[PDB]
A = this chain, B = another copy of it.
Amino acid sequence: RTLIVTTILEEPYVMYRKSDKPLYGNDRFEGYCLDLLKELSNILGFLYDVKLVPDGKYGAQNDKGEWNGMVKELIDHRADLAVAPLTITYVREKVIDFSKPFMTLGISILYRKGTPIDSADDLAKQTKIEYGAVRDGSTMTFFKKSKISTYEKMWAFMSSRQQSALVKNSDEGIQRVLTTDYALLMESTSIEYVTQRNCNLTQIGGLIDSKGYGVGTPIGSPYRDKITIAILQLQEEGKLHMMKEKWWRGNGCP
C-alpha cells in the first residue's frame, strides 16, 4: 500500500538535499515537488517511496513506438505516481492518466539582456542568432510537431546540421546563452526561476503556447482522480501559489 513515486532531478522541483551526513529514503530529496507530494500524501493518506527514474528521462517515444523515462515507468507499473515537472501533452495523455495540472506555463525564450530581440518571430526571421532547445522534452517535441508557420520554420533551423542548436539539459542551455549569441527556448516557469537568480538573463516575449504540469499515473489508476481533487483544492486554498513563491524567490533581480 506504500506508493512508489518516480521523479527526476530538476531544480527547484527535485534536488538532492545539501547535507553534512549521508541521507536516506525520502529525506535525500527536497524541492517544490517534494512539498507537493507531502501535501498530497497527507490529504489522501498514503505513504510513499521516492525513486529517481533510472534512465534519467521525462518520457518520449523512439522511431517506432517505445516509451522511456518516467512515462515508461508508469506504463510498466514500476511506479504508481510520477511527481515531476512533467508536461501534459496529448501524445503522453494517450498512454498514461494525468491528473489535472498543478502548474500552468508555456514555452518562452531565455536570452541575455540588452538586445532588441522581442519575440519568437524576430528569431525565426534571421540566422545570425542561434536558438534551440533541450532534446526530447516537451519543448523540442512541440517545435518538431508544429504546423504553425513560425514554429515549423524554427524547427527546421533547430533540427538542421545534425541538431547542433540543441542542448542536452537546461544547465548547458543556460551556459550557452551566457557565453554565446544563443537564445534558449524554455518553459516559462524555469525562465522565471533562472532570471531571478541570474540578473544577466531575461525572458524574451510572452508564452508561445499554453500547457500544464500534471502528476502521472498508469492508465486506469484509482489514484488519479483523488490526486486531481486534492490538487484542485490545494490550488483554491492558495497553497500551490505559496509553494511556488517559496521555491522561486531566489536572490531577486530587477
Contacts and interface: CB of A to CB of B under 8 A. Distances in A.
B100 A100 contact: yes
B148 A228 contact: no
A192 interface: no
A198 interface: no
Contact of A89 (B89, B94, B142, B236): B236
Given A100-B88, A104-B104, A210-B104, A142 B236 contact: yes
B147 A232 contact: no
How many copies, total? 2
A65 B19 CA distance: 50
Interface string A170-212: 0000000000000000000000000000000000000001111
Contacts of A229: 90, 93-94
A90 B229 CA distance: 5
Interface of A is mostly: mixed
A76 interface: no
A235 interface: yes
A237 interface: yes
Contact of A228 (B93, B142, B235): B93
Given A104-B210, A147-B237, A148-B238, A232 B88 contact: yes
Interface residues of A, number: 29
Interface in A34-68: none
Interface in A204-254: 209-212, 225, 228-230, 232-233, 235-238, 241
Q: Which 6 A-B pairs have the closest CB atoms?
A: A90-B232, A90-B233, A90-B229, A148-B238, A93-B229, A93-B232
Given A93-B229, A142-B236, 18 more contacts: A88-B100, A88-B232, A89-B236, A90-B230, A90-B236, A93-B225, A93-B228, A93-B232, A94-B229, A100-B101, A100-B212, A147-B237, A148-B237, A148-B238, A209-B238, A211-B232, A211-B235, A211-B236
